[PDB]
Amino acid sequence: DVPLTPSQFAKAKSENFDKKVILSNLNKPHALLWGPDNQIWLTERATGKILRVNPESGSVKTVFQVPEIVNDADGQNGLLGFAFHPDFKNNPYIYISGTFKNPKSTDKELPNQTIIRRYTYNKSTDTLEKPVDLLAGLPSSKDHQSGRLVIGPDQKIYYTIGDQGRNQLAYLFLPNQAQHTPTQQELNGKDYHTYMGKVLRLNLDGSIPKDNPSFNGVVSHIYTLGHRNPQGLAFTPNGKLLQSEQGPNSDDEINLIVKGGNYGWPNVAGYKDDSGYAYANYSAAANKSIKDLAQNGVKVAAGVPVTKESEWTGKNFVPPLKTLYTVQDTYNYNDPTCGEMTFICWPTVAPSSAYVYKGGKKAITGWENTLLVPSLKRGVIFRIKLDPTYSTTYDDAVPMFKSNNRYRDVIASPDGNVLYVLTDTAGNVQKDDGSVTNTLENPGSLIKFTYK
Amino acid sequence: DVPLTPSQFAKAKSENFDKKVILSNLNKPHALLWGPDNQIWLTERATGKILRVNPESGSVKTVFQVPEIVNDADGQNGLLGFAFHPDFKNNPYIYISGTFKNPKSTDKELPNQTIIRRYTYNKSTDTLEKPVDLLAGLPSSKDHQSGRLVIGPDQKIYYTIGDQGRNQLAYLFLPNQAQHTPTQQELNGKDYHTYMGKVLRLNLDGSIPKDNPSFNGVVSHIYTLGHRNPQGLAFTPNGKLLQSEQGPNSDDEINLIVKGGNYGWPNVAGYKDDSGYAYANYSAAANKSIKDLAQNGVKVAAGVPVTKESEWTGKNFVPPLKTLYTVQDTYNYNDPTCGEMTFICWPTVAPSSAYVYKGGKKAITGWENTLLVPSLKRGVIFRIKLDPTYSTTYDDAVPMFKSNNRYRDVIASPDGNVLYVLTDTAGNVQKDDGSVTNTLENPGSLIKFTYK
Ligand SMILES: O=C(O)c1cc(C(=O)O)c(-c2[nH]c(C(=O)O)cc2C(=O)O)c(C(=O)O)n1
Ligand SMILES: O=C(O)c1cc(C(=O)O)c(-c2[nH]c(C(=O)O)cc2C(=O)O)c(C(=O)O)n1
Ligand SMILES: [Ca+2]
Ligand SMILES: [Ca+2]
Ligand SMILES: [Ca+2]
Ligand SMILES: [Ca+2]
Ligand SMILES: [Ca+2]
Ligand SMILES: [Ca+2]
Ligand SMILES: [Li+]
């Protein structure tokens, strides 16, 4: 899709909702869920705290704090995945993922691992207990961790793990592994270094499902590959799997996740269109003093090999359902017509989640079969219509709740007339007038939007 | 997708198949079917003849000639739709569509109608009898008739009817009706003038299914709208409906047809990307001597209103699964480096059909879940892979059987190792080196390709 203008974002004020801020100054709140007790549960990525919030009064209790979570002030690591067992009455389990020290790391630049872990909720002591590591030794870095964790209708764990930031900024010269898959030998050794830029599908005990797809002749935890930073993952009522993902300077994506698919990253951003992106592989550059021009591979410094999207020899490439956004090759990523901070003008929205709106007794008129996608950079939440079979999007991503906030997650109440939203404590966001600000209106908040 | 080069087309010679011409004396052969008698049936568009060919021996019979079919030498009208009832043993019906004079027409420039008609097959005399007009008074013209007629798993007729060529060449100043829909009053008077650029869904007696979708508050025969020239229509084994469609100078499409969808034409060609096309509405030009520069609306003469794809206010817009092909706004539709007939290099392939490959006990390796799309202009048959649920394409359109032929239709034998194709009698086609020729290697032929 084509980017909206600053004026088109500014008018998306959602006057048909009442806003109430329930909490602010949470410490990097990240995921929120409607709990089995019809209370709101949310995580703090930086602290490992799991908080429960009463919808009526807003009273908050720190139910548990995941010990030994590692978080860097400038990093996207910490406490990440968070899900309840779907049959919680009979299976009172909470599933998380988190950044933890890796004691066998022999790489001081990458000292941590990601672990997917199960906890048991004890209703009598009202806390979590009896941890069990389901899958450890996963990649960890400060960038593009993703870490969305959901339980599918098949009672498998689906877990997004980002490309760790390879081929940009602090990890510019590390080779991106989004396209790579393990050998049988690596699997035998539990060497999961290729579990970067993937959707994983795990048995509830952490083992490899025997019906997982095969990649390069090996069945592993990998379900799909070729992802950058897929922070959104949600099943539809008819069992399909929708997803949002952050692109580079362009081509954030809404994807339909299909078993064994290849979503193209880093060789293809968005559609395979050779439009506004090319794959510049800095790990293959002649030397590591070369500079990233940050023009999305359309123009690069001498010495870095570039591969057009159309030159990639790919298998099972699956294009996005929608891009937010795609631009022409002649697009100016340094466009001087906004300020010294051109990145705010890049044709992206930085989607942070993806939530399937299920309606209810007070369903919002017209919202049938929609996907809600919060935007960090634009300070909106998108509403994206699909057809009733969730086979295609209809029309465009409709912005809502415009504010100077970085929207991080969103759910709806069971009745469907109330939305609950998390915002980041810090970062940049685009103002009504299109310029950037790092003054956020509601830092680290839980916000309630009630349909009038 | 990005266009293949002339080199890339010329290399698609399919040396793994043996070619044999079965018939070479056909006049504008149009549709090809594997019949319920395990014979090949095919149509001649201008004569109205229905032929049956023994696939083993090659003997042929003219089973029937549809009387009073109207065809213009410079036109795409004539005998079009052709399908068997799916339970032919117990319901020996054949359904056709055709161009016929319209005795009610008061327009000497549009004197004809399209009629969807049923015939009863008499196996004792081997001919068609008892004609019955199921739906009459449909639009007719020389351009963009489409006319694919299939019967779905719901035992409804699905029928493609093109946009009649409005807003180009001889019909430049007629307002395109692809987006328009009937009022209830128009349905009462059987005024089907808005049945242009549609997929229709009809009951087997021609009536309106009671569960057809609503458009602008009215349920009609329309199932989907917003099409230009959709000549390919085919159901998958799991009940999904795939389609191919010719775009203007760009953006031929493979579409997934979903109930109630809007496929965007003429406001959107291909994706809603504002890339290489814009909607120049010559009917809205105040001056009717204005010229169409034929640069796909990117460059226009003074006086014609132009709407960008992103400026359209649309409802239920469904993007294509794949475009053949999409180019940048900087694309040159007049590239003199291509030869004096610059249209031959345009980023299109002119798909003429769409066929779901079902395999069999001699299925061609790697062709699971493929869609075969014949190309008129490039003289190839494309193979397009989808995932096993037919929810997404995988990778690109792979060209096959390159020759100096205009491929019009394609089917496969039950065992899956033989493909049968029809070729046009006349027209232009791209040669190995990219230039244009109107010398076709196999004019008006039924050809088979056998895997060896
Ligand atoms: O303008 C863009 O394209 C853009 C903007 C941002 C932004 O939020 O400022 C991000 C981003 N997302 C996170 C996150 O925690 O999800 C952290 C950052 C960051 O740059 O610090 C990304 C991206 O990561 O692709 N792209
Ligand atoms: O190069 C292109 O884009 C292109 C090329 C052709 C071509 O075949 O030469 C056609 C076309 N298709 C039919 C048909 O019978 O289906 C007739 C014609 C015609 O131009 O006479 C179209 C189009 O109709 O869009 N576009
Ligand atoms: Ca980005
Ligand atoms: Ca992708
Ligand atoms: Ca792209
Ligand atoms: Ca065309
Ligand atoms: Ca279309
Ligand atoms: Ca387009
Ligand atoms: Li005839």
Author numbering:
A (entry chain B), B (entry chain A): 1 to 452
Provide the authors' original text about this structure:
The soluble glucose dehydrogenase (sGDH) from Acinetobacter calcoaceticus has been widely studied and is used, in biosensors, to detect the presence of glucose, taking advantage of its high turnover and insensitivity to molecular oxygen. However, this dimeric enzyme, composed of two identical 453 amino acid monomers (pI = 8.75), also presents drawbacks in terms of broad substrate specificity and loss of activity over time. Briefly, all crystal structures contained a tight dimer of sGDH in the asymmetric unit, the dimeric interface extending over 1110 Å2 being maintained by the presence of two calcium ions as described in Oubrie et al. interacting with the N262-D273 loop, referred to as the 4CD loop in the nomenclature of Oubrie et al.. 2Fobs-Fcalc electron density maps from the wild-type and both mutant structures all showed a different molecule instead of the PQQ-cofactor, corresponding to a PQQ modified cofactor, with the bond between C4 and C5 missing.
We report the characterization of two sGDH mutants: the single mutant Y343F and the double mutant D143E/Y343F. The mutants present enzyme selectivity and specificity of 1.2 (Y343F) and 5.7 (D143E/Y343F) times higher for glucose compared with that of the wild-type. N428T and D143E mutations significantly reduced selectivity for lactose and maltose, with a cumulative effect for the double mutation D143E/N428T. The D143E/Y343F mutant presents a classical Michaelian behavior with both monomer sites equivalent and a single value of KM. For example, at physiological concentrations (5 mM), the Y343F and the D143E/Y343F mutants have a glucose oxidation steady-state catalytic rate constant (kss) 1.5 and 7.1 times increased compared with that of maltose, respectively. At pH 7.5, the addition of catalase slows down the aging of the enzyme. By consuming the H2O2 once it is produced, catalase indirectly maintains the integrity of the cofactor and compared with the enzyme without catalase, increases the retention of enzymatic activity of sGDH for at least 8 h. Numerous attempts to co-crystallize mutant protein with glucose and maltose substrates all failed to locate the sugar substrates in the resolved structures (data not shown). Indeed, as can be seen in Figure 4, the rotation of the pyrrole ring obscures the glucose binding site observed by Oubrie.
